[PDB]
Design a protein around this ligand. Structure first.
Ligand SMILES: N[C@@H](CCC(=O)N[C@@H](CS)C(=O)NCC(=O)O)C(=O)O
Ligand SMILES: N[C@@H](CCC(=O)N[C@@H](CS)C(=O)NCC(=O)O)C(=O)O
Ligand SMILES: [Ca+2]
Lengths: 198, 198
């Protein structure tokens, strides 16, 4: 299918889709817009947010809805309906946390206050729950990689930008990150993707 | 299978699951805990959050992941892969807005203020996008009801508590609510469920 992904020039919420495309070896147009041209584009979107994915002329929105759409019927979805639920739940737990950060907050003091609060108090709790959830298993769900593992690596990458010691008490969570980055298709994407802070 | 839903005594984030069980005529244990129970209950949750749904001894978490699990292979899921994605997208768009509210804010003054600002300055834009999206169609996605419709009725019910005139400019969104509330199984649940503010 003819795929065109539109988002800002950063990993952000579109990265999970980019990882899926890479892993599945699916060609697509990685359209990155400049803030200057956002106002215009925004007015043409049903819900005015990005990323959006155009599939054979049909527009889809919501990054995780799109990610699920692309992984259905693939080895990244989960081996059973229950496991598929586990995958969706891990992704939503991660999304919930990342969404707690005031990324668009212009008030620097208010922004820095919340970032520090989330990173200092909340993050450690989440890392502990994830570590316990993972246990000694290779991947978060089942016996093989799922897009939930992808999302973990993606979300943790951004968290580490602000809190480098985030995983110092969780070697198992570090190893999971490396296991994902070691996947040939993923490693290739990470090596060629635009280098952006977020 | 045996089902046990655990949540507080309120509609909140568990209601979408309760609607699905009602619609599908599936028996389940609707376990409602008291605040005093929280410390003990929380110790058993994978990520310290509710609702959770126990299925034959195994725990599922994240309300929407659970809702998606319960509707798979049912008439509430969406008729095509594309429509299933639209259902997911609308649900996430609604969930995104609901999550903007400071439900746990201790200071009532600041909480009330933020609520009023969100319902006055932001809600209108979302209401218009949803109305435009629905157009003159009977349901949000496809030609029959989906859980996205259930989620609309559920979220709007709570929003209307704080902003009674929320839908005065959108009669079509009110009609959608009524149609969902008119579904026999749903109507019966709405009439018998514990009456709570949220
Ligand atoms: N939960 C949505 C988030 C949509 C969202 O807020 N996107 C941001 C970019 S990270 C954007 O569109 N912001 C520009 C704006 O709101 O005008 C998703 O996962 O796609
Ligand atoms: N996005 C999650 C949210 C889970 C959530 O935050 N649940 C709240 C109750 S509405 C809770 O467990 N809060 C306890 C806490 O924040 O410690 C869902 O839909 O299940
Ligand atoms: Ca979400």
């Amino acid at each position: 299918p003819n795929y065109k992904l539109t988002y800002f020039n950063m990993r952000g919420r579109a990265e999970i889709i980019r990882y899926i495309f890479a892993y599945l070896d699916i060609q697509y147009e990685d359209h990155r817009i400049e803030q200057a041209d956002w106002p215009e584009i925004k007015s043409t979107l049903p819900f005015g947010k990005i990323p959006i994915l155009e599939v054979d002329g049909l527009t889809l929105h919501q990054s995780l809805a799109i990610a699920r759409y692309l992984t259905k019927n693939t080895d990244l979805a989960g081996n059973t309906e229950m496991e598929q639920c586990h995958v969706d739940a891990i992704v939503d737990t991660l999304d919930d946390f990342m969404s707690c950060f005031p990324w668009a907050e212009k008030k620097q003091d208010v922004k820095e206050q919340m970032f520090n609060e989330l990173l200092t108090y909340n993050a450690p709790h989440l890392m502990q729950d994830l570590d316990t959830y993972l246990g000694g298993r290779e991947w978060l769900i089942g016996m093989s990689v799922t897009w939930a593992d992808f999302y973990w690596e993606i979300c943790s990458t951004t968290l580490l930008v602000f809190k480098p010691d985030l995983l110092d008490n969780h070697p198992r969570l570090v190893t999971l990150r490396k296991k994902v980055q070691a996947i040939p298709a993923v490693a290739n994407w990470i090596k060629r993707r635009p280098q952006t802070k977020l």
